[PDB]
Amino acid sequence: RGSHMEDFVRQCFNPMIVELAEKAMKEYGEDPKIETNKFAAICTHLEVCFMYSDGGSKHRFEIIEGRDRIMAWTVVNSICNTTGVEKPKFLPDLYDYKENRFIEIGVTRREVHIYYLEKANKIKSEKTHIHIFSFTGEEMATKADYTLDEESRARIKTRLFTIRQEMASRSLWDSFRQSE
Numbered sequence: 001r002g003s004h005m006e007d008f009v010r011q012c013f014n015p016m017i018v019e020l021a022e023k024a025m026k027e028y029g030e031d032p033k034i035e036t037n038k039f040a041a042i043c044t045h046l047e048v049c050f051m052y053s054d055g056g057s058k059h060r061f062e063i064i065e066g067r068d069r070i071m072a073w074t075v076v077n078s079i080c081n082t083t084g085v086e087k088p089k090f091l092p093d094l095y096d097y098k099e100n101r102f103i104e105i106g107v108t109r110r111e112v113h114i115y116y117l118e119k120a121n122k123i124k125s126e127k128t129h130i131h132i133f134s135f136t137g138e139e140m141a142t143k144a145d146y147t148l149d150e151e152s153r154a155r156i157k158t159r160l161f162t163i164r165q166e167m168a169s170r171s172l173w174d175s176f177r178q179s180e
Protein backbone atom coordinates (compact mmCIF):
# COMPACT_ATOMS: atom_id res chain seq x y z
CA ARG A 1 0.00 0.00 0.00
CA GLY A 2 0.95 3.64 -0.48
CA SER A 3 3.26 3.55 -3.49
CA HIS A 4 4.33 6.69 -5.33
CA MET A 5 3.32 5.04 -8.62
CA GLU A 6 -0.28 4.60 -7.46
CA ASP A 7 -0.64 8.24 -6.43
CA PHE A 8 0.95 9.30 -9.73
CA VAL A 9 -1.55 7.24 -11.75
CA ARG A 10 -4.51 8.84 -9.99
CA GLN A 11 -3.07 12.31 -10.66
CA CYS A 12 -1.95 11.58 -14.25
CA PHE A 13 -5.06 9.91 -15.72
CA ASN A 14 -8.66 11.10 -15.61
CA PRO A 15 -11.07 9.58 -13.07
CA MET A 16 -13.18 7.58 -15.55
CA ILE A 17 -10.00 5.90 -16.82
CA VAL A 18 -8.72 5.10 -13.32
CA GLU A 19 -12.02 3.54 -12.25
CA LEU A 20 -12.35 1.43 -15.41
CA ALA A 21 -8.80 0.13 -14.91
CA GLU A 22 -9.53 -0.53 -11.22
CA LYS A 23 -12.66 -2.48 -12.17
CA ALA A 24 -10.64 -4.39 -14.77
CA MET A 25 -7.84 -5.38 -12.38
CA LYS A 26 -10.17 -6.41 -9.55
CA GLU A 27 -12.28 -8.39 -12.03
CA TYR A 28 -9.16 -10.42 -12.84
CA GLY A 29 -8.18 -10.65 -9.16
CA GLU A 30 -5.38 -8.07 -9.09
CA ASP A 31 -4.66 -5.18 -6.74
CA PRO A 32 -3.91 -1.68 -8.10
CA LYS A 33 -2.29 -0.84 -4.74
CA ILE A 34 0.47 -3.48 -5.11
CA GLU A 35 0.74 -4.29 -8.83
CA THR A 36 1.04 -0.58 -9.50
CA ASN A 37 3.09 -0.75 -12.72
CA LYS A 38 0.33 -2.81 -14.34
CA PHE A 39 -2.22 -0.34 -12.93
CA ALA A 40 -0.35 2.31 -14.91
CA ALA A 41 -0.23 0.04 -17.97
CA ILE A 42 -3.98 -0.54 -18.39
CA CYS A 43 -4.73 3.14 -17.73
CA THR A 44 -2.36 3.99 -20.59
CA HIS A 45 -3.90 1.28 -22.78
CA LEU A 46 -7.41 2.53 -21.97
CA GLU A 47 -6.61 6.17 -22.78
CA VAL A 48 -4.87 5.18 -26.02
CA CYS A 49 -7.87 3.05 -27.01
CA PHE A 50 -10.20 5.99 -26.34
CA MET A 51 -8.08 8.49 -28.28
CA TYR A 52 -7.94 5.98 -31.15
CA SER A 53 -11.73 5.71 -31.43
CA ASP A 54 -11.93 9.52 -31.24
CA GLY A 55 -9.90 9.71 -34.46
CA GLY A 56 -12.43 8.20 -36.86
CA SER A 57 -15.72 9.68 -38.01
CA LYS A 58 -18.85 9.65 -35.85
CA HIS A 59 -20.00 6.02 -36.20
CA ARG A 60 -16.72 4.41 -37.28
CA PHE A 61 -15.59 2.53 -34.17
CA GLU A 62 -17.32 0.22 -31.73
CA ILE A 63 -15.41 0.30 -28.44
CA ILE A 64 -14.88 -3.14 -26.88
CA GLU A 65 -12.13 -2.25 -24.41
CA GLY A 66 -13.31 -0.79 -21.12
CA ARG A 67 -16.42 -2.95 -20.92
CA ASP A 68 -16.92 -5.71 -18.40
CA ARG A 69 -15.95 -9.08 -19.85
CA ILE A 70 -19.50 -10.39 -20.33
CA MET A 71 -20.78 -7.26 -22.09
CA ALA A 72 -17.66 -6.99 -24.27
CA TRP A 73 -18.23 -10.49 -25.64
CA THR A 74 -21.94 -9.73 -26.07
CA VAL A 75 -21.16 -6.82 -28.40
CA VAL A 76 -18.58 -8.93 -30.26
CA ASN A 77 -21.21 -11.61 -30.87
CA SER A 78 -23.61 -9.00 -32.26
CA ILE A 79 -20.85 -7.51 -34.43
CA CYS A 80 -20.03 -10.95 -35.83
CA ASN A 81 -23.68 -11.93 -36.28
CA THR A 82 -24.32 -8.81 -38.41
CA THR A 83 -21.03 -8.51 -40.34
CA GLY A 84 -20.25 -12.19 -40.87
CA VAL A 85 -16.75 -11.63 -39.46
CA GLU A 86 -15.11 -14.56 -37.69
CA LYS A 87 -15.39 -14.56 -33.90
CA PRO A 88 -11.95 -13.58 -32.52
CA LYS A 89 -10.39 -15.98 -30.05
CA PHE A 90 -9.55 -13.22 -27.55
CA LEU A 91 -11.21 -9.92 -26.76
CA PRO A 92 -10.09 -7.16 -29.14
CA ASP A 93 -10.19 -3.47 -28.29
CA LEU A 94 -12.27 -1.91 -31.09
CA TYR A 95 -14.25 -2.77 -34.21
CA ASP A 96 -13.82 -0.74 -37.40
CA TYR A 97 -17.18 -0.31 -39.12
CA LYS A 98 -15.49 1.44 -42.04
CA GLU A 99 -12.99 -1.33 -42.84
CA ASN A 100 -14.89 -4.24 -41.21
CA ARG A 101 -12.17 -5.59 -38.93
CA PHE A 102 -11.46 -5.90 -35.23
CA ILE A 103 -8.48 -3.90 -33.95
CA GLU A 104 -6.08 -5.03 -31.22
CA ILE A 105 -4.17 -1.97 -30.00
CA GLY A 106 -0.83 -2.42 -28.26
CA VAL A 107 1.27 -0.14 -26.06
CA THR A 108 4.77 -1.45 -25.36
CA ARG A 109 7.95 -0.15 -23.73
CA ARG A 110 10.14 -2.44 -25.86
CA GLU A 111 10.87 -2.04 -29.57
CA VAL A 112 7.83 -2.36 -31.82
CA HIS A 113 9.05 -5.45 -33.70
CA ILE A 114 9.06 -7.81 -30.72
CA TYR A 115 5.62 -6.88 -29.35
CA TYR A 116 3.85 -7.14 -32.72
CA LEU A 117 5.25 -10.63 -33.33
CA GLU A 118 4.11 -11.87 -29.92
CA LYS A 119 0.76 -10.19 -30.58
CA ALA A 120 0.53 -11.92 -33.97
CA ASN A 121 1.64 -15.43 -32.98
CA LYS A 122 -0.55 -15.29 -29.86
CA ILE A 123 -3.46 -13.93 -31.91
CA LYS A 124 -3.41 -16.52 -34.71
CA SER A 125 -6.79 -14.99 -35.60
CA GLU A 126 -6.09 -14.30 -39.27
CA LYS A 127 -8.70 -11.57 -39.68
CA THR A 128 -8.11 -9.09 -36.84
CA HIS A 129 -6.02 -5.95 -37.37
CA ILE A 130 -3.09 -5.16 -35.09
CA HIS A 131 -1.75 -1.67 -34.25
CA ILE A 132 1.15 -1.02 -31.84
CA PHE A 133 2.34 2.23 -30.31
CA SER A 134 5.51 2.62 -28.25
CA PHE A 135 6.59 5.08 -25.58
CA THR A 136 9.32 6.37 -27.93
CA GLY A 137 7.05 7.25 -30.86
CA GLU A 138 7.25 4.23 -33.15
CA GLU A 139 4.23 2.43 -34.58
CA MET A 140 3.48 -0.57 -36.79
CA ALA A 141 0.20 -1.95 -38.10
CA THR A 142 -0.89 -4.97 -40.10
CA LYS A 143 -0.22 -4.63 -43.85
CA ALA A 144 1.19 -1.15 -43.09
CA ASP A 145 -2.43 0.08 -42.90
CA TYR A 146 -2.53 2.42 -39.90
CA THR A 147 -6.30 3.05 -40.26
CA LEU A 148 -6.35 6.58 -38.84
CA ASP A 149 -4.97 9.85 -40.19
CA GLU A 150 -1.45 11.03 -39.38
CA GLU A 151 -2.60 13.73 -36.95
CA SER A 152 -4.70 11.39 -34.80
CA ARG A 153 -1.92 8.84 -34.29
CA ALA A 154 0.61 11.65 -33.82
CA ARG A 155 -1.22 13.06 -30.80
CA ILE A 156 -1.38 9.53 -29.40
CA LYS A 157 2.42 9.35 -29.65
CA THR A 158 2.76 12.83 -28.11
CA ARG A 159 0.66 11.77 -25.11
CA LEU A 160 2.65 8.55 -24.65
CA PHE A 161 5.94 10.45 -24.50
CA THR A 162 4.50 13.00 -22.06
CA ILE A 163 3.53 10.10 -19.78
CA ARG A 164 7.11 8.82 -20.02
CA GLN A 165 8.61 12.17 -19.00
CA GLU A 166 6.33 12.68 -16.00
CA MET A 167 7.26 9.17 -14.87
CA ALA A 168 10.97 9.83 -15.38
CA SER A 169 10.80 13.17 -13.56
CA ARG A 170 9.50 11.22 -10.53
CA SER A 171 12.14 8.45 -10.85
CA LEU A 172 9.35 5.98 -11.67
CA TRP A 173 10.22 5.32 -15.33
CA ASP A 174 13.09 2.91 -14.64
CA SER A 175 10.82 0.67 -12.57
CA PHE A 176 8.03 0.79 -15.16
CA ARG A 177 10.23 -0.03 -18.15
CA GLN A 178 11.60 -3.15 -16.42
CA SER A 179 8.12 -4.32 -15.40
CA GLU A 180 7.25 -5.36 -18.97
Ligand SMILES: O=C(NCCOc1ccccc1)c1nc([C@@H]2CCCN2C(=O)CCc2ccccc2Cl)[nH]c(=O)c1O
Pocket residue numbers: 024025026028030038041042045091093105106107
Ligand atom coordinates in the same frame (compact mmCIF):
# COMPACT_ATOMS: atom_id res chain seq x y z
O1 LIG B 1 -7.08 -7.01 -23.36
C1 LIG B 1 -6.08 -7.40 -22.76
N1 LIG B 1 -6.10 -8.25 -21.74
C2 LIG B 1 -7.34 -8.75 -21.16
C3 LIG B 1 -7.56 -8.27 -19.75
O2 LIG B 1 -6.45 -8.71 -18.95
C4 LIG B 1 -6.30 -8.19 -17.70
C5 LIG B 1 -5.25 -8.61 -16.90
C6 LIG B 1 -5.09 -8.08 -15.64
C7 LIG B 1 -5.97 -7.13 -15.17
C8 LIG B 1 -7.01 -6.70 -15.96
C9 LIG B 1 -7.18 -7.23 -17.23
C10 LIG B 1 -4.71 -6.91 -23.17
N2 LIG B 1 -3.65 -7.46 -22.56
C11 LIG B 1 -2.43 -7.04 -22.89
C12 LIG B 1 -1.24 -7.67 -22.18
C13 LIG B 1 -0.37 -8.56 -23.08
C14 LIG B 1 -1.13 -9.87 -23.04
C15 LIG B 1 -1.42 -10.02 -21.57
N3 LIG B 1 -1.60 -8.63 -21.12
C16 LIG B 1 -2.03 -8.31 -19.88
O3 LIG B 1 -1.82 -9.09 -18.96
C17 LIG B 1 -2.74 -7.01 -19.64
C18 LIG B 1 -1.86 -5.91 -19.05
C19 LIG B 1 -1.47 -4.84 -20.05
C20 LIG B 1 -0.14 -4.62 -20.41
C21 LIG B 1 0.21 -3.64 -21.31
C22 LIG B 1 -0.76 -2.85 -21.88
C23 LIG B 1 -2.07 -3.03 -21.55
C24 LIG B 1 -2.42 -4.02 -20.64
CL1 LIG B 1 -4.12 -4.20 -20.26
N4 LIG B 1 -2.25 -6.08 -23.84
C25 LIG B 1 -3.32 -5.50 -24.49
O4 LIG B 1 -3.13 -4.63 -25.35
C26 LIG B 1 -4.59 -5.95 -24.13
O5 LIG B 1 -5.62 -5.39 -24.76
Ligand SMILES: [Mn+2]
Pocket residue numbers: 065091092093
Ligand atom coordinates in the same frame (compact mmCIF):
# COMPACT_ATOMS: atom_id res chain seq x y z
MN1 LIG C 1 -8.13 -5.41 -24.51
Ligand SMILES: [Mn+2]
Pocket residue numbers: 045092093104105106
Ligand atom coordinates in the same frame (compact mmCIF):
# COMPACT_ATOMS: atom_id res chain seq x y z
MN1 LIG D 1 -5.02 -4.12 -26.73
